[PDB]
Design a protein around this ligand. Structure first.
Ligand SMILES: Nc1ncnc2c1ncn2[C@@H]1O[C@H](COP(=O)(O)OP(=O)(O)OP(=O)(O)O)[C@@H](O)[C@H]1O
Ligand SMILES: Nc1ncnc2c1ncn2[C@@H]1O[C@H](COP(=O)(O)OP(=O)(O)OP(=O)(O)O)[C@@H](O)[C@H]1O
Ligand SMILES: Nc1ncnc2c1ncn2[C@@H]1O[C@H](COP(=O)(O)OP(=O)(O)O)[C@@H](O)[C@H]1O
Ligand SMILES: [Mg+2]
Ligand SMILES: [Mg+2]
Ligand SMILES: [Mg+2]
Ligand SMILES: [Zn+2]
Lengths: 390, 310, 209, 105
DNA sequence: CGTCTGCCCGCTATGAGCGTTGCATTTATCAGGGTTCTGGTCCACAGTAT
DNA sequence: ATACTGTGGACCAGAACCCTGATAAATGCAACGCTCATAGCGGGCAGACG
């Protein structure tokens, strides 16, 4: 399922990161030059593939939404914070000087006695931290976490021990606030990244909820799991009786006592249930009375991917203004609108993008998302309160 | 099993399997046997285990662990190999790989004595503190589980406690420090501790693998040695000087404790049978007493060298 | 492994390891009943062979699949039509194995993801999506999340065919409207006799033939 | 009332009322085979009519009962002979009520 | 001042999840034989006193 | 130079774990009943019409 990378140990420059096999085998901490060049991607746009037929030129232009990424200012901060909380979560879990063997020995009692606060050692602390990500839908919470966590090898294998360190794991919450289906998504996502059978032996034996909350966090320490990511934490709002608080108590006992870092993602509708929090917003055209440099760069880098024969290199201010007007800042809407306009231009035969064409494409093919964009356009808090997720 | 712990330094493989069970929360012994082995008809054995070969396959990715290394360094094989012979030793090594517990025990002498001598768990007060200080865990160790001596080689005495291997025949049990010790005075005999410290280096010695003198070699070696001591009448034993020397070296209470009480009046005895032609391989402990009573200027490895030479 | 060693020895400054595929493309077709939302699909998907067998591999690529929603509005009866419609295209049985009652909706949603890439399935068409409104099984927020989770797991493109009554189900929040209109939303209207000030050239071509 | 908590707790000495007392005697009869122990006992016991039905109360007083130990000597086939012999003299279904359910000794 | 139109609302049906249960399978228990290990034995061998 | 005795070696069987068989008791699992959330119907009861 996942490729096992044999570990080679570098020389870290931090006193605390002294002799851990876990954090001296991770890729080196990048710098500001590599915080904005290890994420960039764009379509090739070969000049040989512009004179081809309409069908080829219309199938090769739909790959823009998947293969285009431009790191903004917020991604730098997110990458730095994830790096810190994934490198600092192992110092209290040293496997050399008998510190991880003191975290696995305690966790056997919690499986036996069923209580998640029965320490056997008092000298084994926890050093993990927590993060909370909240932003409007379409802001980029997942596709900018699958390119910032994609520079780490996931399953690593250390042969000095027999440990198979899983650097990061990603699961998502149940469609309701279920109790035994959050501790089963963990197993279903852990045994398809290792090729093992953990779901078929943890859960099929008719266990209670407490035993399945203890076995999950014990097997998350048998493999030195570095970061646990839970997507769509807003699914706990419609929980069962007491599920909206028992799981949020577990998610603060896991980072504080057991020591596994945890990161949570949700739409601003998930602020009601409540952890350092990061808030994301759609790009604003005006920052200090002048057009935003990030927005200008985003637009002028997207405009250089065009398969239309009668393309215009120069981007008009009116075209940019109407693009922002019809998009209202959400990057998903921006990219999708550009792609749809390009496809409709190829279909008609007129191969130059116009403001009128943009408006027609919007009005004809963005019907469901109309009221949310209009609410954000109006900017009245009373209209914003219903939908638009801002 | 996707993550099998490497054995610590000088450990029994039984403790390794028990810790493998601990590290993943496999409380049910049947589930542990299913996951580690695949069959529910295995016996948890301390000293001369079987089914190695599926244990050495879990550690196959680690280059340094092979079947011979577990057989020699993490099981109590070096205490039987030099004495049984050559063909029996090779057959036993071949049978430790496969799934036969009975044949492995039959090939070896006291393994075929069909009694589990002091099957209760042992531990040493001071050793557990050192292991907690250095490794952070507490494991069973080959030093504690000597075949007949209930004593740690370096410290005084082994503090016993209840429960045993045969109470549950399909469960591996791992020591927890919460039962660290109980403070009650116990004193150990000096010569018995000396015997433990004399026999301990045989465990950690590479030369014990290939030095297994044959039966006629043993009897001829003892015959010439007894002739050199000068206590040997023409094709006869004095039966008095040897008893006097062993009684001076080891007291009566010791011989009671290790279950080799002398019967000089009885013609058949553990000490008497050594002088005559050897019929079957004698236990390591009898040879240890003979060596320590006769000549203390040579170690166990030196004695093995002298026996193997001629 | 070569990339890992080069970046660890400092020779190569940055390297990108394996990545995970993003959300599946979704389309929503909404048209008044009697406009041909099923005949058009059955005459467009008929040019694609359903089950293709590959020799060098061992996968029976099921190019498309068409299932229909349940009248209860239930959510375990649209995860089970998947097996009951994969049994009429292939020969093997799946409702006997994966269609038990012990498995919950989430488990039935994570076992229709293994057999969705074991056979390289290409499209999943769900017909008459209007039936899910006002069902006794669960509330209005136990299925608006079920679609989000289902789109986020299976990975095969999803097509939804429904009635203008089912627009109100998906125009409830930005998440569901973003995912439902993933690759455009197609809206169908009856043929008008005249367009602008001239007679239509579609009605005449549909009548005179 | 005392006997209900013996069923519930499972221990045959947990008596709730101190005022309740036991007034019973025990005996054993041993003799060589052919002495006539069984038929003598039956002749002695034929004088009492076994199931006497009281009227002011509702109890059916079973004066005496007779069971024999199983050949196996098992622990479950001596507590079932009692139920099999208590409905062959009353006509009830005590064995189906008690024996068939999964019960420990 | 009675009623008859909206509002309550008691009630029937339905489905998903959880708790409960009986059968087949597994596990354990005991009797009988056996075959090679061993436990001691008797006899030959050899060294010796008359 | 010849009888008496201590001792090693070949050797009868006792027996103890292993195998086989039948019989009784303890679980795992497939099937069934209990509980709660949700949507709706139509009859009976408080305000307006005559
Ligand atoms: N910074 C960005 N640059 C370019 N494209 C982006 C950026 N952020 C998001 N996108 C585009 O947005 C698309 C959809 O957004 P994404 O999947 O990240 O949303 P999300 O945060 O998971 O939404 P939801 O609220 O539904 O969970 C991606 O496929 C990607 O192409
Ligand atoms: N006192 C007696 N007078 C006449 N006949 C007698 C007497 N005692 C015994 N018998 C006769 O001896 C037989 C008694 O049989 P029964 O089986 O009762 O004896 P048992 O040996 O005591 O029984 P059990 O099988 O219970 O040990 C009958 O044939 C009965 O007629
Ligand atoms: N483009 C078309 N040309 C001719 N007939 C059509 C066309 N579209 C639909 N029909 C007719 O409409 C009828 C009903 O279509 P149907 O498949 O029921 O669509 P829906 O399910 O949306 O009502 C079909 O019998 C078909 O003959
Ligand atoms: Mg997402
Ligand atoms: Mg139709
Ligand atoms: Mg009788
Ligand atoms: Zn010690």
């Amino acid at each position: 399922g996942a490729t096992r990378i044999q570990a080679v140990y570098r020389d870290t420059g931090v006193e605390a990161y002294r002799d851990n096999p876990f954090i001296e085998a991770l890729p080196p901490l990048q710098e500001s030059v590599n915080s904005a060049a290890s994420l960039k991607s764009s379509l090739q746009l070969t000049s040989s593939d512009l004179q081809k037929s309409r069908v080829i030129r219309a199938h090769t232009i739909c790959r823009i939404p998947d293969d285009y990424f431009q790191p903004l200012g917020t991604h730098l901060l997110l990458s730095e914070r994830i790096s810190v909380m994934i490198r600092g979560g192992y110092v209290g879990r040293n496997p050399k000087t008998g510190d991880l063997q003191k975290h696995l020995q305690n966790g056997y009692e919690r499986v036996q006695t069923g209580e998640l606060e029965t320490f056997r050692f008092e000298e084994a602390r926890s050093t993990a931290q927590s993060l909370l990500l909240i932003g409007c839908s379409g802001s980029g919470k997942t596709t900018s976490l699958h390119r910032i966590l994609a520079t780490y090898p996931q399953v690593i294998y250390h042969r000095e021990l027999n440990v198979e360190q899983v650097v990061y794991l990603k699961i998502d919450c149940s469609h309701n606030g279920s109790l035994k289906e959050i501790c089963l998504n963990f197993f279903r996502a852990l045994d398809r990244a290792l090729g093992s059978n953990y779901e078929r032996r943890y859960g099929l034996k008719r266990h209670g909820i407490e035993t399945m909350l203890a076995l999950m966090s014990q097997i998350a320490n048998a493999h030195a799991l570095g970061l646990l990511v839970i997507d769509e934490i807003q699914h706990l709002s419609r929980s069962r009786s007491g599920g909206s608080q028992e799981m949020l108590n577990f998610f603060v006992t896991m980072v504080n006592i057991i020591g596994v870092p945890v990161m949570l993602i949700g739409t601003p509708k998930a602020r009601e249930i409540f952890f350092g929090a990061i808030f994301w917003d759609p790009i604003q055209q005006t920052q200090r009375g002048k057009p935003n440099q990030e927005w200008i760069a985003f637009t002028d880098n997207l405009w250089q991917l065009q398969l239309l024969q009668r393309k215009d290199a120069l981007l008009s201010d009116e075209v940019r203004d109407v693009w922002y007007e019809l998009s209202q800042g959400v990057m998903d809407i921006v990219v999708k609108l550009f792609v749809l306009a390009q496809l409709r231009a190829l279909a008609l035969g007129n191969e130059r993008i116009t403001a009128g064409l943009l408006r027609q494409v919007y009005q004809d093919e963005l019907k469901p998302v109309h009221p949310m964009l209009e609410a954000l356009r109006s900017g009245i808090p009373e209209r914003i309160a219903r939908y638009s997720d801002l | 099993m996707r993550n099998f712990p490497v054995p610590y330094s000088n450990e029994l493989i039984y403790s390794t399997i028990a810790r493998a069970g601990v590290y993943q929360g496999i409380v049910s012994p049947k589930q542990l046997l299913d996951e580690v082995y695949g069959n529910r008809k295995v016996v948890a054995t301390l000293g001369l285990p079987s089914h190695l070969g599926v244990i050495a396959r879990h550690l196959h990715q680690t280059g340094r662990y092979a079947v011979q290394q577990l057989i020699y360094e993490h099981t109590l094989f070096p205490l039987y190999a030099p004495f049984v012979g050559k063909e029996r030793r090779d057959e036993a090594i071949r049978l430790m790989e496969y799934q036969a517990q009975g044949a492995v025990h039959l090939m070896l002498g006291v393994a075929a004595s069909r009694v589990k001598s002091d099957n209760r768990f042992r531990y040493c007060p001071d050793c557990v503190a050192l292991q907690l200080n250095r490794y952070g865990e507490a494991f069973w160790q080959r030093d504690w589980y000597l075949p007949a001596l209930p004593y740690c080689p370096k410290h005084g005495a082994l503090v016993f406690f209840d429960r045993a291997v045969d109470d549950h025949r399909h469960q591996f049990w791992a020591l927890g420090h919460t039962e660290l010790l109980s403070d009650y005075p116990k004193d150990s005999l000096s010569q018995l501790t000396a015997l433990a410290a004399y026999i301990a280096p045989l465990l950690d010695a590479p030369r014990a693998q290939e030095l297994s003198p044959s039966l006629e070699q043993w009897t001829l070696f003892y015959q010439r040695l007894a002739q050199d001591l000068g206590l040997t009448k023409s094709k006869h034993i004095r039966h008095d000087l040897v008893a006097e020397r062993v009684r001076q070296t080891f007291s009566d209470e010791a011989l009671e404790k290790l279950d080799l009480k002398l019967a000089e009046n009885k013609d058949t005895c553990w000490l008497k049978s050594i002088f005559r032609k050897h019929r079957k391989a004698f236990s390591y402990l009898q040879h240890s007493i003979v060596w320590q009573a006769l000549l203390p200027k040579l170690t166990v490895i030196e004695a093995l060298q002298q026996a193997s030479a001629l | 492994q070569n990339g890992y060693e080069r970046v660890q020895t400092g020779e190569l400054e940055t390297f990108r390891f394996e990545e995970a595929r993003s959300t599946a493309q979704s389309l929503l077709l909404i048209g008044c009943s009697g406009s041909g939302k099923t005949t058009s699909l059955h005459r467009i998907l008929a040019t694609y062979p359903q089950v293709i067998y590959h020799r060098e591999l061992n996968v029976e690529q099921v190019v498309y699949l068409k299932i229909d929603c349940s009248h209860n509005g239930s959510l375990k009866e649209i995860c089970l039509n998947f097996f009951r419609a994969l049994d009429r295209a292939l020969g093997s049985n799946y409702e006997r194995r994966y269609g038990l009652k012990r498995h919950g909706i989430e488990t039935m949603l994570a076992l229709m993801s293994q057999i969705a890439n074991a056979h390289a399935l290409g499209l999943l068409v769900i017909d008459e999506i209007q039936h899910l409104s006002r069902s006794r099984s669960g509330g209005s927020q136990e299925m608006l999340n079920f679609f989000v989770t289902m789109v986020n797991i299976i990975g095969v493109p999803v097509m939804l065919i429904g009635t203008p009554k089912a627009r109100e189900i998906f125009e409830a929040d930005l998440r569901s409207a973003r995912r439902g209109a993933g690759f455009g939303a197609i809206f169908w209207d009856p043929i008008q006799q005249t367009q602008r000030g001239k007679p239509n050239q579609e009605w005449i071509a549909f009548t005179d033939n």
